[PDB]
């Protein structure tokens with residue numbers, strides 16, 4: 021169907037005639053007309069919120085995949101991890117033997133949390149500074165879509181395909197954020213991993 | 222006294238000369254000049270906040286009445302409920318015998334939480350969709366005051382009486398929201414119902 | 423260095439070219455170009471946020487000093503307090519003997535929490551009303567800098583020195599807010615006072 025312009029899909033379905041704010045016109049990906057708290061009435065605040073949403077969504081997709089993969093590997097493939105549960109995997113650094121990637125001592129075999137934290141601080145600070153402005157992989161032509169070195173396979177060369185892929189990215193990312201919130205609440209309530217919860221249901 | 226225009230009541234009393242933002246001019250009900258975080262400086266955000274406040278206030282009035290009525294009935298009138306305390310009344314669905322209205326098995330006698338949740342989802346979704354736009358009880362001429370089928374006794378026919386009733390509604394609703402927050406904090410801290418807390422004090 | 427105008431210090435250092443919003447131009451103290459959520463895009467909301475930040479910062483500086491002083495006095499100077507830890511000092515009013523200033527019964531020797539609360543309500547309400555508008559120590563020339571009776575030593579007479587002192591005040595206040603957040607998190611996690619935590623590390 022349509023995901024742009026005035027004939028797009030809306031968040032309340034057939035009951036969304038009086039639910040769409042005026043400043044939401046279908047210009048940007050993911051516009052379902054859902055701003056009922058008026059948090060994006062300011063155009064600059066709207067742009068900041070769009071960037072925040074896309075960054076949160078990409079992090080959430082990565083987090084869903086990385087929270088599911090080791091638990092599923094332990095359950096089925098037989099790979100042994102110190103703590104394969106996503107909300108317990110941070111405590112392996114304090115257990116004796118450290119964090120062994122895929123359970124193999126010959127791999128990373130990290131033993132100090134301080135070195136991990138400092139390396140992450142330096143590397144992530146540099147990477148985020150590059151994302152905001154400049155960087156050796158190209159400059160920040162777009163805050164969200166700098167597809168020169170970050171689009172090396174050329175999926176975004178066609179503008180219509182680019183718009184469709186933007187819609188797909190925002191939808192998958194919103195689903196991943198919803199799934200991550202579900203993971204957080206399930207971990208808080210039941211104390212079981214998502215794979216184990218799925219198996220027991 | 223006066224609750225509209227430039228000579229209205231203000232939230233700091235005689236010390237509110239420098240406390241009223243410029244965009245608050247006494248045009249809408251409940252305007253005491255209290256916006257110190259600047260959350261309603263944008264007119265569209267102000268309208269959204271007004272709608273949110275009125276909806277929260279009506280829900281809070283209903284919640285105060287519904288949280289007080291069963292406990293008071295159990296304490297004095299002698300009516301027997303499974304769990305008459307407001308923050309324990311949700312767990313009656315898991316107790317054997319289910320939820321009996323007024324404690325009578327011949328009444329609702331619900332035992333499945335899933336059916337209750339699904340019926341509530343369908344009915345409340347339809348009702349909220351009607352409230353936002355359209356609906357078989359008239360269309361949404363006003364987001365907050367669609368008084369054609371929802372004002373059948375004609376209390377809002379006189380504009381001056383309508384303004385006074387709007388002021389009364391917003392004030393009672395703010396008081397009910399304050400009372401509901403008090404209920405939440407008292408339940409969290411002491412673990413006793415509002416009626417029992419009142420009796421013991 | 424420079425803390426005003428377009429050649430000022432910025433929050434991302436050499437990577438802050440694309441990190442500074444347009445509405446942040448170096449006109450106000452503490453402008454490092456850090457508004458990534460777009461919460462201050464509206465100028466009136468920006469002014470409200472500036473007032474909130476400065477008030478929070480002054481309260482945080484006072485809180486750091488007042489949370490460190492009694493614990494350090496007990497540890498080193500030998501002064502005896504009922505509860506010298508900052509997050510336990512509120513419970514001395516319920517212990518027998520009350521709250522003795524510097525541990526001396528001849529001092530305040532308060533016994534009732536209700537009188538303390540009522541006196542604080544009256545005095546702080548009057549003082550905050552004076553701060554917002556009017557007051558017997560001068561009227562509110564500036565929401566944040568009413569330096570007539572509140573600047574009696576005349577440190578703010580020179581405009582350039584006034585700007586430098588504003589920068590120093592906002593920086594020390596932000597550091598104190600960061601320290602107070604650290605105090606809160608350390609108290610929540612370890613249950614030990616900042617002085618004791620410093621000694622054991």
Ligand code: CHL
Pocket residue numbers: 077078079080081082085164165166167168170171175176182185186188189192193
């Ligand atoms: C389904 C998810 C998804 C979709 C549809 C898109 C879609 C898009 N992205 Mg986006 N992204 C997605 C996830 C993510 N993106 C990014 C990061 C970026 C960047 C930095 C850039 C884009 C760009 C683009 C565009 C180019 C076409 C493309 O990449 O097709 C997406 C193709 C697929 C989804 C095919 C399926 C691949 C999948 C099986 C890979 C699995 C990998 C593993 C999970 C491991 C990944 C580890 C990480 C660290 C690399 C298009 C709008 C570029 C752009 O806009 O250029 C103009 C651009 O510069 N994306 C992250 C964070 C790492 C994502 C994951 O969370």
Ligand code: CHL
Pocket residue numbers: 278279280281282283286365366367368369371372376377383386387389390393
């Ligand atoms: C003190 C409370 C209160 C007051 C003063 C008003 C005042 C007003 N409302 Mg509002 N409302 C109030 C509570 C509520 N209203 C609504 C929902 C609406 C709607 C949908 C509409 C109004 C409208 C109106 C206007 C017409 C006059 C009127 O209703 O007089 C209020 C009369 C009284 C308060 C008299 C006392 C009645 C009380 C004893 C009833 C008790 C009932 C039980 C608690 C059970 C209720 C169960 C629920 C589910 C129905 C006026 C501005 C109409 C409007 O603006 O038309 C232009 C309109 O369309 N109100 C809800 C949510 C259910 C409330 C409760 O929380």
Ligand code: CHL
Pocket residue numbers: 479480481482483484487566567568569570572573577578584587588590591594595
């Ligand atoms: C390092 C902290 C700090 C700095 C640099 C400034 C700087 C400034 N303040 Mg600000 N303030 C500071 C903390 C605080 N101020 C205030 C409250 C005000 C007011 C109400 C006013 C100012 C004004 C001024 C200006 C005049 C110059 C001045 O006071 O020099 C600051 C000098 C120093 C920091 C020297 C060091 C003093 C220090 C050792 C004192 C320690 C005292 C104890 C902790 C006990 C304090 C108890 C409290 C209750 C009084 C300037 C912009 C005035 C203005 O803008 O006029 C135009 C004005 O009206 N400030 C509070 C809340 C109590 C603070 C503490 O948290």
Ligand SMILES: CC(=C/C=C/C(C)=C/C=C/C=C(C)/C=C/C=C(\C)C=C=C1C(C)(C)C[C@H](O)C[C@@]1(C)O)/C=C/[C@@]12O[C@]1(C)C[C@@H](O)CC2(C)C
Pocket residue numbers: 082143144146147156
């Ligand atoms: C989230 C995440 C982030 C990774 C960030 C990285 C890698 C940053 C690198 C960040 C790397 C950085 C900043 C590199 C920087 C290199 C630079 C500056 C090189 C250079 C130079 C110099 C020095 C010669 C100097 C010259 O003047 C300029 C220039 C340019 O010539 C990784 C997650 C996962 O790795 C886990 C944790 C577990 C896995 O199972 C799954 C995945 C997803 C792979």
Ligand SMILES: CC1=C[C@H](O)CC(C)(C)[C@H]1/C=C/C(C)=C/C=C/C(C)=C/C=C/C=C(C)/C=C/C=C(\CO)C(=O)CC1=C(C)C[C@@H](O)CC1(C)C
Pocket residue numbers: 054055056057058059076077079080082083084085086087105106107108109110197198200201
């Ligand atoms: C729209 C709208 C309109 C109205 O007007 C107002 C409104 C209603 C407010 C508004 C609505 C707003 C809504 C719905 C907001 C909801 C937002 C949500 C749920 C965001 C969730 C974000 C979640 C994220 C980033 C998760 C990242 C996880 C990672 C990192 O990648 C790891 O898992 C990393 C990881 C892995 C992979 C392995 C583990 O072992 C260890 C760790 C480190 C945890």
Ligand SMILES: CC1=C[C@H](O)CC(C)(C)[C@H]1/C=C/C(C)=C/C=C/C(C)=C/C=C/C=C(C)/C=C/C=C(\CO)C(=O)CC1=C(C)C[C@@H](O)CC1(C)C
Pocket residue numbers: 255256257258259260277278280281283284285286287288306307308309310311398399401402
């Ligand atoms: C103004 C202002 C200015 C500044 O500039 C910035 C600022 C300071 C931020 C700002 C101030 C903002 C303020 C003060 C905000 C405070 C808001 C509050 C407290 C809102 C409270 C809302 C409460 C509600 C909806 C309660 C509903 C309860 C129900 C549902 O009806 C039931 O009880 C239902 C129920 C019943 C009846 C029986 C039970 O058994 C079961 C359940 C289901 C629970």
Ligand SMILES: CC1=C[C@H](O)CC(C)(C)[C@H]1/C=C/C(C)=C/C=C/C(C)=C/C=C/C=C(C)/C=C/C=C(\CO)C(=O)CC1=C(C)C[C@@H](O)CC1(C)C
Pocket residue numbers: 456457458459460461478479481482484485486487488489507508509510511512599600602603
């Ligand atoms: C910038 C920015 C940009 C982006 O775009 C968006 C963004 C990221 C959101 C945004 C960033 C925002 C940030 C970082 C916000 C953080 C704010 C913080 C940490 C504020 C902390 C405030 C702390 C205060 C007032 C503490 C007062 C303590 C007192 C009272 O004086 C006592 O201790 C009093 C006391 C004493 C002294 C003795 C004890 O015994 C008893 C008690 C009563 C406790």
